[PDB]
Amino acid sequence: HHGYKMVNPPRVVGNWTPKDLSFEYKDVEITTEDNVKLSGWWIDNGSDKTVIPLHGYTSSRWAEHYMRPVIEFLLKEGYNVLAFDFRAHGKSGGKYDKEILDLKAGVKWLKDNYPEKSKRIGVIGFSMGALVAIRGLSEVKEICCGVADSPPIYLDKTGARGMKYFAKLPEWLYSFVKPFSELFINVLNYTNSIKKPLFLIIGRRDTLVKVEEVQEFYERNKHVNPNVELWVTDAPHVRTIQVFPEEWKSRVGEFLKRWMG
């Protein structure tokens, strides 16, 4: 095989909007510093606080097993929400590292256009989005706190684990899933630079990320960050909010109340 010059994620657009949660919202376009046009929802909930939920690789803002519940949860807590698709995902433009530019653009859009709605900004990321949340908490000054649910710490190891499950499929399904494996950053370096409140969540039934990996991130970061916390759960990858919704929302709700005001 000769490899792949380029592998763009699938684009999945769901069939619900914040209207289905009984919240008014705007469809907006956000432009990044490298001129990528992102698609998102601006959901003005009458707050001076905004939380930005970040979806995973190959996912989108619609993912019903974690994005719909987290957006509903955030709005019911009274926060404003900006929820956008990462580049090349969902309805966003761009051809498929750079997702930090997407988050920076979203924060800039809030500060430029709705500063009164974004006096405080928090981030919640899932899977790939949890890595972007971690990077954002380090590099984006306007973010005051972050939740990182199932962050891959060792991208190569996580990639290799996924591959272990490809052996079982029929050949047509294999050639479908393989390019995204091959398409699939030093995460631990961020343990030195994150000094802001951080809530790490990792599940024991996660077949992509080991609890030991997130535990080591915690052990390193806690020596320079007095507000990092770790929750080890009994759920699969990014599905604590699905399997343990009451506890996830209680704990994350308390964390956000603590830092968002």
Next chain:
Amino acid sequence: HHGYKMVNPPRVVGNWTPKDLSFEYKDVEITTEDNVKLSGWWIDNGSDKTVIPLHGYTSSRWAEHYMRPVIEFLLKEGYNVLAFDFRAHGKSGGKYDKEILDLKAGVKWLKDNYPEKSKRIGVIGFSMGALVAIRGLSEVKEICCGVADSPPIYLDKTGARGMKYFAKLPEWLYSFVKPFSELFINVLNYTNSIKKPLFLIIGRRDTLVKVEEVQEFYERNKHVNPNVELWVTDAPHVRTIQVFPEEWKSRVGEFLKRWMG
């Protein structure tokens, strides 16, 4: 679940070009009647004959297990080749029935711009592309012959078969593959309208399309088409050319020589 408003196929771009086969080629853009911009290779091989190889759903012109071999084969036979990505696949534009418009646009581009290179036009399709080849042979007058390798005859049944294999995967892989199942036309109607040479190829180890389905298409069409042929092979879906390359190329080469001149 609320369903999917829209599911765009993954975009897979490989790392080979016709230069790697030692053939000069042009990167071209072809515009459909509904204004979709397709990407393709125009490979002028000094012939008055062009063959158009059509890839499958979620695939692209690069697929190394059938598209690279068929393009190499066609060029070594001395045919010109126009090889494009269907809408929303590979490098082609469009948001994801309509693939017949893509084929019509390719044929129009040849006839408009290179009529001397396309005195005869043949089509070879694989999987979804084989359905488009069948439809093209019926509806596009400029096409003189077609090869349909592994055409789904009953799209709903083929879709249902694929789903049988989803039960085995870990939950993260499932939510990845499911939208394309749900996203996934009366094919047998074409048995009445196809009157031009048609080579049907179907494998016994095909887990998506039953040999009986393609056999029934053959039985119906042969009463109005004196030049339809059927080859039942021992290969998996679209992989006769991979498992039996010499026989595939010998038989398809003879078919094309018979009709292309």
